[PDB]
Design an enzyme around this catalytic site. Structure first.
Site, PDB file in Angstrom:
ATOM      1  N   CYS A  52      -4.984   0.783  10.983  1.00  0.00           N
ATOM      2  CA  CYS A  52      -3.587   0.513  10.604  1.00  0.00           C
ATOM      3  C   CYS A  52      -2.542   0.721  11.605  1.00  0.00           C
ATOM      4  O   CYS A  52      -2.319   1.857  12.091  1.00  0.00           O
ATOM      5  CB  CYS A  52      -3.227   1.356   9.327  1.00  0.00           C
ATOM      6  SG  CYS A  52      -1.690   0.717   8.569  1.00  0.00           S
ATOM      7  N   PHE A 100      -6.812   4.603   6.555  1.00  0.00           N
ATOM      8  CA  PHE A 100      -6.153   3.665   7.491  1.00  0.00           C
ATOM      9  C   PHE A 100      -7.139   2.843   8.338  1.00  0.00           C
ATOM     10  O   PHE A 100      -6.746   2.264   9.368  1.00  0.00           O
ATOM     11  CB  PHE A 100      -5.151   4.417   8.321  1.00  0.00           C
ATOM     12  CG  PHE A 100      -3.963   4.998   7.500  1.00  0.00           C
ATOM     13  CD1 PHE A 100      -2.970   4.172   7.067  1.00  0.00           C
ATOM     14  CD2 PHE A 100      -3.887   6.367   7.238  1.00  0.00           C
ATOM     15  CE1 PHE A 100      -1.892   4.617   6.302  1.00  0.00           C
ATOM     16  CE2 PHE A 100      -2.842   6.893   6.474  1.00  0.00           C
ATOM     17  CZ  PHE A 100      -1.834   6.021   5.989  1.00  0.00           C
ATOM     18  N   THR A 138       0.805  -1.248   0.000  1.00  0.00           N
ATOM     19  CA  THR A 138       0.000   0.000   0.000  1.00  0.00           C
ATOM     20  C   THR A 138       0.843   1.306   0.000  1.00  0.00           C
ATOM     21  O   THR A 138       0.426   2.357  -0.562  1.00  0.00           O
ATOM     22  CB  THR A 138      -0.967   0.022   1.210  1.00  0.00           C
ATOM     23  OG1 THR A 138      -0.222  -0.338   2.391  1.00  0.00           O
ATOM     24  CG2 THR A 138      -2.069  -0.995   1.013  1.00  0.00           C
TER      25      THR A 138
HETATM   26  C1  HEM Z   1      -0.433   3.971   2.843  1.00  0.00           C
HETATM   27  C2  HEM Z   1      -0.077   2.830   3.405  1.00  0.00           C
HETATM   28  C3  HEM Z   1      -1.138   2.000   4.173  1.00  0.00           C
HETATM   29  C4  HEM Z   1      -2.460   1.947   4.023  1.00  0.00           C
HETATM   30  C5  HEM Z   1      -3.376   2.797   3.044  1.00  0.00           C
HETATM   31  C6  HEM Z   1      -2.981   1.039   5.042  1.00  0.00           C
HETATM   32  C7  HEM Z   1      -4.278   0.707   5.198  1.00  0.00           C
HETATM   33  C8  HEM Z   1      -4.752  -0.142   6.213  1.00  0.00           C
HETATM   34  C9  HEM Z   1      -6.125  -0.427   6.468  1.00  0.00           C
HETATM   35  C10 HEM Z   1      -7.307   0.233   5.704  1.00  0.00           C
HETATM   36  C11 HEM Z   1      -6.199  -1.271   7.544  1.00  0.00           C
HETATM   37  C12 HEM Z   1      -7.516  -1.860   8.116  1.00  0.00           C
HETATM   38  C13 HEM Z   1      -7.845  -3.163   7.431  1.00  0.00           C
HETATM   39  C14 HEM Z   1      -9.146  -3.838   7.820  1.00  0.00           C
HETATM   40  O1  HEM Z   1      -9.947  -3.141   8.531  1.00  0.00           O
HETATM   41  O2  HEM Z   1      -9.514  -4.944   7.312  1.00  0.00           O
HETATM   42  C15 HEM Z   1      -4.864  -1.614   7.894  1.00  0.00           C
HETATM   43  C16 HEM Z   1      -4.505  -2.495   8.927  1.00  0.00           C
HETATM   44  C17 HEM Z   1      -3.252  -2.902   9.132  1.00  0.00           C
HETATM   45  N1  HEM Z   1      -2.114  -2.353   8.628  1.00  0.00           N
HETATM   46 FE1  HEM Z   1      -1.934  -0.899   7.139  1.00  0.00          FE
HETATM   47  N2  HEM Z   1      -1.840   0.481   5.594  1.00  0.00           N
HETATM   48  C18 HEM Z   1      -0.680   1.066   5.252  1.00  0.00           C
HETATM   49  C19 HEM Z   1       0.605   0.826   5.566  1.00  0.00           C
HETATM   50  C20 HEM Z   1       1.010  -0.139   6.482  1.00  0.00           C
HETATM   51  C21 HEM Z   1       2.363  -0.442   6.912  1.00  0.00           C
HETATM   52  C22 HEM Z   1       3.591   0.331   6.481  1.00  0.00           C
HETATM   53  C23 HEM Z   1       2.275  -1.470   7.794  1.00  0.00           C
HETATM   54  C24 HEM Z   1       3.461  -2.117   8.534  1.00  0.00           C
HETATM   55  C25 HEM Z   1       4.474  -1.396   8.964  1.00  0.00           C
HETATM   56  C26 HEM Z   1       0.888  -1.841   7.872  1.00  0.00           C
HETATM   57  C27 HEM Z   1       0.333  -2.787   8.672  1.00  0.00           C
HETATM   58  C28 HEM Z   1      -0.945  -3.008   8.973  1.00  0.00           C
HETATM   59  C29 HEM Z   1      -1.340  -4.022   9.973  1.00  0.00           C
HETATM   60  C30 HEM Z   1      -0.456  -5.084  10.695  1.00  0.00           C
HETATM   61  C31 HEM Z   1      -2.819  -3.970  10.078  1.00  0.00           C
HETATM   62  C32 HEM Z   1      -3.788  -4.802  10.944  1.00  0.00           C
HETATM   63  C33 HEM Z   1      -3.852  -4.076  12.256  1.00  0.00           C
HETATM   64  C34 HEM Z   1      -4.886  -4.771  13.180  1.00  0.00           C
HETATM   65  O3  HEM Z   1      -5.997  -5.182  12.784  1.00  0.00           O
HETATM   66  O4  HEM Z   1      -4.436  -4.970  14.314  1.00  0.00           O
HETATM   67  N3  HEM Z   1       0.097  -0.997   7.080  1.00  0.00           N
HETATM   68  N4  HEM Z   1      -3.949  -0.872   7.094  1.00  0.00           N
END
Ligand code: HEM
Length: 451
Positions: free
Chosen positions: A394, A387, A262
Site C-alpha cells: 500500500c 497493507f 478501506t
Molecule cells: C486502511 C486503509 C487501507 C488498506 C487496508 C489498504 C490495503 C492495501 C492493500 C492490501 C494493497 C495491496 C493490494 C494488492 O496486493 O493487490 C494496497 C495497495 C494500494 N493502496 Fe491501499 N489500503 C489502504 C489505504 C489506502 C489509501 C489511503 C490510499 C491512497 C492514499 C491507498 C492506495 C493504494 C494504492 C495506489 C495501491 C497500489 C500500490 C501499488 O501496487 O503500487 N490505500 N492497499
C-alpha cells in the site's frame, strides 16, 4: 504432500461451496476446516488459498512470487486501467507511476496534508455535535463522507462537500452503479429490456469522466503541491517520462476510490470494536483526552496517540478491509517444502485468516486486544499484512493511518458512544469490507473546537 481441497461436484468443481455474496467469510470457514492451504477450483479456474504465516512468508519472497491480478482486479481493470492497483509489476506503467507518485507520501507531504485532514475531521465532529436529541449516526456512511472528502481535498484540492449532502456524492453512486451493471451484464443471456441499463451505464461513466475532466481542468486553470501535481508534472527518474494522459485519468479514479473505501471501513470497524469492548474504549478515550489538549490536533499530537494506533491495528488484524491479495509463481518452485507449483500458479492470501494464526498470536485470536500491538517491532515479519507486501504494498498506508488516528482521536475526545441497537456484526463485501448498518448514538462531552 497432496494439497487439501474442498469436495468437488463434477464439472461445477468447488463452485457450489461459494454461492454467497460474502465469499471471503466463506473461505475463512473452509480454511478453519482444511488448514493453512487449500486448492479451490471453479470452471475455468484454480487458485490456492494461504492462511499461515509459514506459507505466506514464503509467498512474500518477491524473487519467487509476484503480485497477480485476481478475478476481481481483472474486472476492475476495465475502469481503473493500468493505474497503480490494477497494473502488473512487469507493466512499464507500474514502475513509472510508483516512482512519480511515491513522493506524495513523503514526510514533508504528510505534514502538508495534516491541516486539510483536520478541516474534514472538524466537519464530522460538528455534524455530530449538531444532532438533536435521540438522533443517531450511520457510522460507515459518515466515515465514507469523511474519507472521500479527505482524499479529494488532500490529493486533488477538490471539495466533494459530502457533509452538505444527505445522500452520497453522485461520483460514488455512479461508480458503484457502473461496477454493479458491469458485473450484472457478465451473467446475462441485447433484449431491448436492457436499453435503460445501457443508458444508465453511459450516464454513470460520464459522471466519472466529467469529474476527472474537472479536477484536471480546474488545476490547469490554477500554486499547489499534492498528488495531482506529481501526476501532471512529475517525471520518472529512471526514464525521464511523465505519465501519459490516459494513465493520469486512471490514476485519479484509482486514488479517489482506493484512497477512501478501506479507511472508512477501518474507522467503522474500530468504533464497532470500541463499543463492544468498553474497557478498551475507556483506555483509548483517556489517551485522547490526555494528548489532544488543544482545540484542534497538531501533527505531533496525532503521532502521540499510541493506544489509538494500537486500536486501529487491532481492528485491521481482525477485519483487514482489503482482505485478500493475490500472487503467482514466477517460475516452477516448491512451497513450504511440500507443495510443488508451476510457473503461473495463483496463490491468494486470506489476510483475515493469517491474522488468526494461533501459532503466531496465541489462542485468543478472536479477542479485541490492542495491547498485542504494544511493541510492534517484535511481531514476526509477515504475520500482520493488512497493507499487502513488498514493492506492491500500500502506497497509502501512512496517509490512511494518520487520517484514522486523527479522526478516531477526535471522536473519542469529543463524544461518549452508545451501541443503542446492540448491533449484530454484518460484514458486507464489495471491493472492501464494512460493518453494514452499524449505527451508534453519540453524547457530546461539550469540549469546544478551534476556529
Ligand atoms: C486502511 C486503509 C487501507 C488498506 C487496508 C489498504 C490495503 C492495501 C492493500 C492490501 C494493497 C495491496 C493490494 C494488492 O496486493 O493487490 C494496497 C495497495 C494500494 N493502496 Fe491501499 N489500503 C489502504 C489505504 C489506502 C489509501 C489511503 C490510499 C491512497 C492514499 C491507498 C492506495 C493504494 C494504492 C495506489 C495501491 C497500489 C500500490 C501499488 O501496487 O503500487 N490505500 N492497499
Amino acid at each position: 504432500k497432496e494439497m487439501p481441497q474442498p469436495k468437488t461436484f463434477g464439472e461445477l468443481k468447488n463452485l457450489p461451496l461459494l454461492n454467497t455474496d460474502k465469499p471471503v467469510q466463506a473461505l475463512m470457514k473452509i480454511a478453519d476446516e482444511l488448514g493453512e492451504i487449500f486448492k479451490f477450483e471453479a470452471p475455468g479456474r484454480v487458485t490456492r488459498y494461504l492462511s499461515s504465516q509459514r506459507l505466506i512468508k514464503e509467498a512474500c519472497d518477491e524473487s519467487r512470487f509476484d503480485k497477480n491480478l485476481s478475478q476481481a482486479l481483472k474486472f476492475v481493470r476495465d475502469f481503473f486501467g493500468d493505474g497503480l492497483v490494477t497494473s502488473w509489476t512487469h507493466e512499464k506503467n507500474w514502475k513509472k507511476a510508483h516512482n512519480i507518485l511515491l513522493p506524495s507520501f513523503s514526510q514533508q507531504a504528510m505534514k502538508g496534508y495534516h491541516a486539510m485532514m483536520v478541516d474534514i475531521a472538524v466537519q464530522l465532529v460538528q455534524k455530530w455535535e449538531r444532532l438533536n436529541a435521540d438522533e443517531h449516526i450511520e457510522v460507515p456512511e459518515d466515515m465514507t463522507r469523511l474519507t472521500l472528502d479527505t482524499i479529494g481535498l488532500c490529493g486533488f484540492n477538490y471539495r466533494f462537500n459530502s457533509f452538505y449532502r444527505d445522500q452520497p456524492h453522485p461520483f460514488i453512486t455512479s461508480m458503484v452503479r457502473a461496477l454493479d451493471e458491469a458485473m450484472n451484464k457478465l451473467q446475462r443471456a441485447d433484449d431491448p429490456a436492457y436499453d435503460e441499463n445501457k443508458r444508465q451505464f453511459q450516464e454513470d461513466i460520464k459522471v466519472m469522466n466529467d469529474l476527472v475532466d474537472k479536477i484536471i481542468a480546474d488545476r490547469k486553470a490554477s500554486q499547489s503541491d499534492d498528488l495531482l501535481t506529481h501526476m501532471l508534472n512529475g517525471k520518472d527518474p529512471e526514464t525521464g517520462e511523465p505519465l501519459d494522459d490516459e494513465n493520469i485519468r486512471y490514476q485519479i479514479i484509482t486514488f479517489l476510490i482506493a484512497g477512501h473505501e478501506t479507511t472508512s471501513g477501518l474507522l467503522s470497524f474500530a468504533l464497532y470494536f470500541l463499543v463492544k469492548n468498553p474497557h478498551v474504549l475507556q483506555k483509548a478515550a483517556e489517551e485522547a483526552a490526555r494528548v489532544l489538549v488543544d482545540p484542534v490536533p497538531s501533527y505531533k499530537q496525532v503521532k502521540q496517540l499510541k493506544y489509538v494506533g494500537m486500536v486501529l491495528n487491532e481492528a485491521l488484524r481482525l477485519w483487514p478491509t482489503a482482505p485478500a491479495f493475490s500472487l503467482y509463481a514466477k517460475e516452477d518452485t516448491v512451497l513450504g517444502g511440500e507443495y510443488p507449483l508451476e510457473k503461473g500458479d495463483e496463490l491468494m492470501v486470506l489476510i483475515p485468516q493469517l491474522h488468526r494464526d494461533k501459532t503466531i498470536w496465541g489462542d485468543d485470536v478472536e479477542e479485541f486486544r490492542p495491547e498485542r500491538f504494544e511493541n510492534p517491532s517484535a511481531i514476526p515479519q509477515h504475520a500482520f499484512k493488512p497493507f499487502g507486501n513488498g514493492q506492491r504494498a500500500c502506497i497509502g498506508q501512512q496517509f490512511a493511518l494518520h487520517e484514522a488516528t486523527l479522526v478516531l482521536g477526535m471522536m473519542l475526545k469529543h463524544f461518549d458512544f452508545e451501541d443503542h441497537t446492540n448491533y449484530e456484526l454484518d460484514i458486507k463485501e464489495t471491493l472492501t469490507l464494512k460493518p453494514e448498518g452499524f449505527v451508534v448514538k453519540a453524547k457530546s462531552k461539550k469540549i469546544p473546537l478551534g476556529g
